[PDB]
């Protein structure tokens, strides 16, 4: 263990080191040009090979934290470009690394990355493959300076995979665009989850996080003993607190540790793990954390012995409340992978709340014998909406369904921005497609999964530009109560309808040109605007107007002189709708 650079270069491989060095630098120095970092990276790599050859050589003894610092502080235009940051360089180390972390900018002012024409990509990718990929790695890096670097590195390679396949396929855009849309979407998702998880830790504190993890880890490793789960939860909770804080190496090394541990103690934890524990350093902890729920033990009791019918319960509770409730959750979670992490927390919070009454009451055993009764309705609420709504998505496909929701929520929260209403109805809709194709024993996690990100995205927009007290309530409640609070929203019976607008219901023959996506967005803005103009309108009345609009369109887009039909027939539609409503 002579040299941390040498170890990390041996550990990683040149090609990975190089990628990670690049992502590291790109995250701290977001206003420098790609070609500058190639210079850095290669300067570091060239250096890193010295030490691999002879860990005694100049500076090899130095700390990665110290060599990264020294590198940063030899950028000349550093005060010019960044200003405050430069002042960090005047600190001797331990603080200096902190000072660079402090003065990172999350969310700079940078132009949106344009996706080129398919053919430009494939061509460039052929012409010069590495410079193509790293360039774009450099661009996502600077735009997400707090994203775990090897996770990012993992996407680059799924990216490389998608070029390698489709730029040798006759119909390039037919292949590539969905693959890339998948990845766009799967990275915004990921890059939100991290922001949520960290924000959850600061606001709600370390306790609740452990609660969450226990439920989770127990769902995943049901054969493990509660102490093992506790060992895991604990270290895992360290890991999130350190990775949030933004130190790459602390986050990395901590994670590495945990992967060693899990694979060394493999038999104690999960059968479904051999696979992952084969994969090399970088992929290990990624893989572990993605992995399937292990199959549950056949020989499995009711909980009721240890948590209802035993005496010694109030003693066992009071002896250590958080550990006893831990045990409750461990036992309840591993019996139910088909529950949402959050569902299981509603059980524990409800349980908790009874013992607070019943251990302090005259007859404890009798104050609480009817408590798993209290769970019955808590488990059915999420189960029912799933059945109800996945039934409804079965009737009307993804699209007709999106419009069902678009009506639903526009009624509930009419004050929302119309685009905002369209995007979430659209996004929700998609969840329906994804999660409803699973069986019932597998739906409720999937949906928690998705809803949680949508529901957050929702609440960030709202944080920035507030529009509704009732929304604010949900976004400023526990991540446990979040989804129900939304489900609890009712039709806004206060709402004053919006002044009719001629232009809003005028359409032109340009929509017949537009892609089915493009069209649908046009149609769907209308439907909202319609809902916001005549909210007191019935589904029947609405399916009426919607069907007319639909015929109208397909009349003027199967007609000579399209433009003048849209002005004339549209004149009718509006008057005849204005009427019916
Ligand atoms: C001059 C030195 C600059 C810093 C070097 C770049 C940092 C790369 C090291 C990250 C190692 C990641 C370890 C994998 C842990 C995991 O499984 O996620
Ligand atoms: C990581 C390397 C990314 C390679 C893909 C380049 C295309 C980026 C366009 C962004 C998008 O998908 O919306
Ligand atoms: C290894 C011990 C883990 C500690 C387990 C904590 C048990 C608490 C379970 C109830 C859910 C807590 C959610 C936070 C919000 C609240 O209820 O106040
Ligand atoms: C799945 C269908 C997705 C369509 C969006 C609207 C349905 C939302 C109901 C799902 C309930 C989420 C369960 C997670 C929980 O709170 O425990
Ligand atoms: C920026 C703020 C936008 C807010 C959009 C308000 C619309 C509410 C959407 C909540 C969807 C959650 C799914 C709940 C399922 C249910 O209806 O029971
Ligand atoms: C005041 C009334 C104004 C009436 C204007 C009619 C607006 C209709 C927009 C509905 C879009 C329905 C699309 C359904 C489909 O794809 O078939």
From Swiss-Prot:
Record protein name field: Albumin
Keyword Glycoprotein tagged: yes
Sugar attachment sites: 10, 49, 135, 160, 197, 223, 231, 274, 279, 311, 315-316, 321, 349, 376, 411, 437, 442, 492, 523, 532, 534, 543, 571
Consequence when changing residue 571 to E: In Gent/Milano Fast
Modified residues (N6-succinyllysine): 203, 434, 517, 562
Modified residues (N6-methyllysine): 532
SMART domains xrefs: ALBUMIN (SM00103)
Annotated site residues (Not glycated) in this chain: 2, 18, 39, 62, 71, 91, 104, 134, 157, 172, 179, 188, 193, 203, 210, 238, 260, 272, 284, 357, 370, 387, 400, 412, 430, 434, 464, 473, 498, 517, 522, 536, 539, 555, 558, 562, 572
Chain positions recorded as Ca(2+) 2 binding sites: 11, 253, 257
Disease (UniProt): Hyperthyroxinemia, familial dysalbuminemic: A disorder characterized by abnormally elevated levels of total serum thyroxine (T4) in euthyroid patients. It is due to abnormal serum albumin that binds T4 with enhanced affinity. Analbuminemia: A rare autosomal recessive disorder manifested by the presence of a very low amount of circulating serum albumin. Affected individuals manifest mild edema, hypotension, fatigue, and, occasionally, lower body lipodystrophy (mainly in adult females). The most common biochemical finding is hyperlipidemia, with a significant increase in the total and LDL cholesterol concentrations, but normal concentrations of HDL cholesterol and triglycerides.
Binding sites annotated in the UniProt record for Ca(2+) 1: 4, 242, 247, 250
Domain Albumin: 1-184, 185-377, 378-575
GO molecular function: antioxidant activity; copper ion binding; DNA binding; enterobactin binding; exogenous protein binding; fatty acid binding; identical protein binding; protein-folding chaperone binding
Keywords assigned by UniProt, alphabetized: Calcium, Cleavage on pair of basic residues, Copper, Disease variant, Disulfide bond, Glycation, Glycoprotein, Lipid-binding, Metal-binding, Methylation, Phosphoprotein, Repeat, Secreted, Signal, Zinc
Binding site for Zn(2+): 65, 245, 247
Residues recorded as bearing Phosphothreonine in the entry: 81, 418, 420
Tissue specificity: Plasma.
Protein family membership: Belongs to the ALB/AFP/VDB family.
Functional note: Binds water, Ca(2+), Na(+), K(+), fatty acids, hormones, bilirubin and drugs. Its main function is the regulation of the colloidal osmotic pressure of blood. Major zinc transporter in plasma, typically binds about 80% of all plasma zinc. Major calcium and magnesium transporter in plasma, binds approximately 45% of circulating calcium and magnesium in plasma. Potentially has more than two calcium-binding sites and might additionally bind calcium in a non-specific manner.
Residue positions, PTM Phosphoserine: 3, 56, 63, 271, 417, 487
Disulfide bonds, paired cysteine numbers: 51-60, 73-89, 88-99, 122-167, 166-175, 198-244, 243-251, 263-277, 276-287, 314-359, 358-367, 390-436, 435-446, 459-475, 474-485, 512-557, 556-565
Post-translational modification: Glycated in diabetic patients.
Annotated site location: Aspirin-acetylated lysine: 197
